[PDB]
């Protein structure tokens, strides 16, 4: 009771890697005389080899000093490997500070096995270099970098990344410039782009005649060409774009940016439309570059985002509309104060028709997520409390409220400045935030009061999204969540109606449901025509990257809508584009194979929920249709040999008869034992001495 | 809690007036009725347990979609009109429904029953994986499977083994529960089996142990019941009328098919009759692993030694073999069963079935 109550309420973290840590350092969690009582259990299970039942009593007492004293002699491999899947969570609560104090004893020895899983999860600087010390094979150092680079989370933005990615010659560092491209989505994403040329499906691309019909003509080309490069249709005819004017010209050029996605340099081909005559033509160029460079902060071999950042300055409107929205996508993973310093005075007056600052709240959320900055924390906090300029309407108030409900993830003591803005103005989405602060601060979740308390407020749109994230890691509230999702689907306001399909579309890939598609039938005509115009596009968001199969019931609903008017001809094209989006095969991944969570994919869901509402109530901008591409993760399963470089090798079959390096597949395991941390996705395999083969 | 304090609390205060008009129609002396037929004119048929069958008008309380023929509702002593519907969460509507998605049993874990796998795989997995092969021949793949033998070996293992490779949800329905306690629910439970599994249909329906309802005798009276014919006649129309690509599957189990209704068989819809095969060394070790897990055994006790010399016993005698081995330790007052008790109990059960087969034949 002394160590539990002292380690319960605190503003700091828990655990230390120092060898002289008795857990008496700093704040005193327990008396000095009572410390020897916890060590009395160590000599008991030491000779008896009771480590199986010794961990059971170690997690209940919550003592960080007991673990490093228990492990002394004999084998550090089999004994420590059992603690990998046992120690961190047996009980519903999560204590991550136990494995941190045991690093000092292993520092002189460690092992090839237990030092692997220590580099992921918390990911301390001493844990990553620990496995590199006992590994004398440069091949095994490569495999350890694939699971770490895909984790992102803590270390993302500039000042950490690309500084380590340079590299030198040493045994304790060994980060190659090629490993950053192989581990991270750099080289492998380009092979999938070229491999789609042979596997491409039929194309609906047509240019028609009239400019009113050229808007839907070029717009569908952006969805069809995702992951595909077609230079024949764009270069041969330049009239299918320029004929569009107003807000349609910006969305037409953005479709070309999807062609150049995952390319070395996409700015050269888009330079022709960068400056011609009219600002409306110049506006679409900025939105197209952000789509082509989305997913990579530094590019591949060159930082192509250096020139894009300098184009944000402009007194005009249509260009500034696509400058804030277009650039707020490709900058994920790269933090710079030059774009923040220029955007701060523009977002002060927040005038929609002139400066078009309404998208500044969504741009700052997708870029700076998972970063540490004192400039954006202080400036937005003062502007929110002062309520300066003309700000009155709740629309812009909810933008700054939901923008600050993101950046504080992965912070700790920096969250206290954000909490002042949350408790200032009450919001329906900010009531559930107070109980979710302990998720990131206490390093994990699953307590009774951290889940069930969210279900009482539901029986607005932010609380239902958090249920899907907690149910993936809990076997209790997961079964009862299926019933609560059906009652929240029918409600007066449209905010909760539009949130459910976005959350169910990810769950429904492996679990189709008839009740979800049947609601979308009556979801079209309800009250206002704005819901009907948004209903056609909402039914395509769930079927993105999938055709026929389970969607055959949903496909019949979109076939009855062709053209009911001049505008309906364009609206129905948005449904056909998402159906064939990515040549018919795509996916949505909110997590990775490292058993962690990415704050970028989570921030893209909250950003998409705020935007995209142009056809629905609260008209903002028609350029928000491309927001979905910011959160779409690639789908591939790689394979490697002992050389570490990409090479053709055969693995287990997928969903198409063989899977090579750079070919599409998802959720496929392997029976071959790898070197270090055999998992899904990219892995370096090996062959047993029994049979000798090159495949 | 905090969010709903400013929402639900002022909501119930404004909705209190509508609740006062309800209770006036509700009334204190309520009763439980029984539905028969629902018509769009707001009229129904209700019965209280003393059987005064009435006919009354349906008032406005809840949507008609919540009302289903054959259910229980609420009544009042004045006009005997329906004042509300009774909650069905406590009383199960079907007989026995257990939904098992992606079970543990597979084709490789059932032992030497592979001879039975080749027959069930062609009638289940083959039309599901490659439905286009039957379109060229213009034939309907049989959705039914007739199982023989005793439970615990052939019927229990193979039932859940087919759902693993086909990625199907296992539904176990007791066959002796097809006549359930009430008159008029025969055609209702038959539709609920195909209705729940008809929307999605990654599922295979399983039925076992029918000794009764398959026999209509010579009439529905003089010892017979009308509930027997309600389920049998409706099951024939639902199985023959409903055709699909091989998603929905219904598999029954019976020891003797001579007593079943030949009209219910409907030849050509179910072409699959699977016999019972004897377990090999692999299957017998699976039954022993369940009982010997909690049973105490020394390091000299091996599952391969017991199955080496055996009379090839069924699942009932194998379970009784380990049962008799435990009595030898109780008479000697010991908690640890040695290897001699398993060998001694194996010979006793083996000699209780077949020994000399009445030696003869010259």
């Amino acid at each position: 009771d002394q160590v539990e109550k002292d380690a319960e309420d605190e503003t700091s973290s828990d655990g230390s890697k120092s060898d002289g840590s008795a857990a008496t350092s700093g704040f005193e969690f327990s008396k000095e005389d009572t410390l020897r009582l916890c060590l009395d259990i160590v000599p008991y299970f030491l000779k008896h080899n009771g480590e199986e039942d010794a961990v059971d009593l170690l997690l209940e007492i919550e003592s960080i000093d007991k673990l490093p004293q228990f492990v002394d002699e004999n084998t550090f491999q089999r004994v420590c490997q059992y603690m990998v899947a046992c120690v961190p969570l047996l009980p519903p609560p999560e204590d991550v500070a136990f494995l941190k104090t045991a690093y000092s004893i292993y520092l002189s020895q460690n092992e090839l096995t237990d030092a692997i899983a220590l580099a992921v999860r918390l990911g301390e600087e001493d844990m990553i270099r620990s496995v590199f010390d006992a590994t004398s094979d440069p091949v095994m150092h490569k495999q350890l970098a694939y699971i770490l680079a895909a984790q992102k989370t803590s270390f993302e933005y500039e000042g950490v990344q690309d500084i380590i990615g340079n590299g030198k010659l040493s045994e304790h560092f060994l980060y190659l410039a090629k490993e950053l491209n192989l581990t991270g989505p750099k080289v492998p994403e380009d092979i999938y782009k070229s491999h789609l040329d042979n596997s491409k499906s039929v194309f609906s691309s047509a240019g028609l005649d009239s400019a009113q019909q050229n808007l839907a003509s070029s717009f569908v080309n952006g969805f069809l060409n995702l992951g595909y490069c077609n230079d024949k249709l764009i270069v041969d005819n330049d009239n299918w774009v320029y004929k569009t004017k107003g807000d349609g010209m910006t969305s037409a050029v953005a479709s070309i940016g999807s062609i150049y996605q995952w390319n070395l340099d996409g700015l050269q081909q888009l330079d022709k439309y960068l400056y011609v005559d009219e600002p409306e033509v110049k506006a679409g160029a900025l939105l197209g570059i952000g789509i082509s460079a989305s997913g990579v902060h530094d590019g591949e071999v060159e930082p192509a985002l250096l020139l894009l950042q300098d184009y944000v300055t402009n007194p005009d409107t249509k260009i500034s509309s696509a400058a804030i929205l277009g650039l707020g996508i490709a900058f994920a993973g790269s933090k710079n104060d030059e774009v923040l310093g220029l955007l701060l005075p523009i977002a002060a007056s927040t005038d929609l028709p002139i400066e078009t600052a309404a998208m500044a709240s969504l741009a700052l959320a997708h870029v700076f997520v998972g970063t540490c900055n004192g400039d954006i924390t202080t400036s937005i906090m003062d502007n929110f409390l002062e309520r300066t300029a003309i700000e009155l309407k709740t629309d812009w108030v909810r933008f700054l409220a939901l923008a600050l409900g993101i950046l504080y993830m992965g912070q700790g003591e920096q969250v206290d400045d954000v909490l002042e803005t949350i408790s200032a103005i009450e919001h329906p989405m900010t009531s559930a935030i107070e109980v979710l602060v302990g998720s990131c601060a206490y390093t994990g979740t699953g307590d009774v009061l951290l889940i069930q308390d969210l279900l009482h407020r539901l029986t607005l749109a932010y609380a239902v999204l958090g249920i899907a994230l907690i149910a993936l890691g809990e076997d209790i509230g997961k079964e009862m969540s299926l019933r609560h999702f059906g009652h929240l689907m029918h409600y007066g306001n449209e905010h909760i109606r539009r949130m459910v399909p976005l959350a169910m579309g990810i769950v429904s890939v492996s679990d189709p449901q008839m009740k979800v598609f049947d609601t979308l039938t009556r979801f079209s005509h309800d009250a206002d025509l704005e819901v009907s115009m948004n209903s056609i596009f909402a039914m395509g968001l769930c079927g993105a990257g999938t055709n026929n199969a389970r969607l055959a019931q949903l496909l019949r609903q979109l076939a009855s809508y062709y053209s009911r008017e001049q505008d309906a001809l364009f609206i129905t094209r948005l449904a056909q584009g998402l159906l064939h989006l990515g040549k018919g095969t795509m996916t949505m991944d909110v997590f990775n194979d490292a058993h962690v969570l990415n704050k970028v994919t989570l921030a893209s869901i909250l950003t998409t929920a705020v935007g995209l509402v142009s056809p629905s109530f609260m008209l903002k901008h028609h350029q928000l249709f491309y927001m979905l591409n910011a959160g779409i993760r690639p789908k591939f399963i790689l394979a490697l040999n002992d050389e570490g470089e990409p090479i053709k090798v055969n693995v287990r079959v997928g969903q198409p008869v063989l899977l090579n390096h750079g070919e599409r597949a998802e959720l496929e395991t392997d029976e071959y034992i790898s070197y270090t941390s055999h998992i899904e996705g990219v892995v370096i395999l090996k062959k047993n001495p029994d049979y000798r083969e090159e495949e | 809690f905090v969010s709903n304090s400013e929402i639900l609390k002022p909501f119930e205060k404004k909705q209190e007036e509508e609740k006062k008009q309800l209770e006036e129609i509700r009334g204190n002396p309520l009763s439980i009725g029984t539905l028969e037929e629902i018509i769009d004119d707001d009229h129904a048929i209700v019965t209280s347990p003393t059987m005064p069958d009435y006919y009354v008008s349906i008032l406005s309380f809840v949507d008609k979609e919540l009302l289903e023929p054959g259910c229980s509702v609420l009544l009042h002593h004045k006009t005997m009109s329906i004042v509300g519907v009774l909650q069905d969460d406590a009383d199960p509507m079907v007989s026995v429904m257990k939904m098992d998605k992606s079970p543990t049993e597979s084709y490789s874990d059932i032992g030497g029953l592979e001879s039975q796998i080749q027959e069930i795989k062609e009638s289940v997995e083959l039309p599901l994986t490659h439905p286009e092969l039957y379109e060229e021949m213009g034939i309907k793949p049989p959705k039914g499977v007739i199982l023989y033998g005793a439970p615990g070996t052939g019927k229990t293992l193979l039932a859940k083994a087919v759902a693993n490779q086909t990625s199907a949800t296992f539904l176990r329905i007791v066959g002796s529960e097809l006549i359930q306690k009430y008159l008029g629910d025969g055609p209702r439970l038959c539709r609920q089996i195909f209705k729940v599994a008809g929307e999605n249909a990654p599922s295979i329906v399983f039925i076992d142990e029918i000794d009764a309802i398959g026999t209509k005798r010579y009439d529905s009276n003089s010892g017979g019941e009308r509930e027997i014919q309600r389920t049998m006649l409706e099951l024939l129309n639902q199985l023959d009328g409903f055709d699909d690509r091989g998603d929905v599957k219904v598999i029954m189990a019976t020891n003797k098919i001579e007593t079943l209704d030949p009209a219910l068989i409907r030849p050509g819809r179910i072409d699959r009759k699977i016999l019972f095969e004897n377990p090999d060394l692999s299957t017998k070790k699976k039954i022993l692993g369940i009982h010997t897990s909690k049973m105490n055994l020394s390091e000299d006790v091996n599952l391969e030694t017991l199955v080496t010399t055996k009379d090839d016993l069924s699942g009932a005698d194998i379970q009784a073999m380990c049962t008799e081995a435990g009595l030898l330790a109780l008479r000697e007052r010991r908690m640890q069963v040695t290897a001699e008790d398993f060998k001694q109990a194996k010979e006793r059960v083996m000699k209780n079935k077949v020994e000399e087969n009445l030696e003869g034949l010259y």
Partner: peptide, 29 residues
């Protein structure tokens, strides 16, 4: 908007069902 019209069928009509239906059901139907 449509939430009131959904319950309106079971509220406004219930007032007419008090006098109208009970009179038609008089006589223990």
């Amino acid at each position: 908007l449509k939430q009131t019209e959904n319950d309106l069928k079971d509220i406004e009509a219930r007032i007419k069902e008090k006098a109208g239906v009970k009179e038609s059901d008089t006589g223990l139907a």
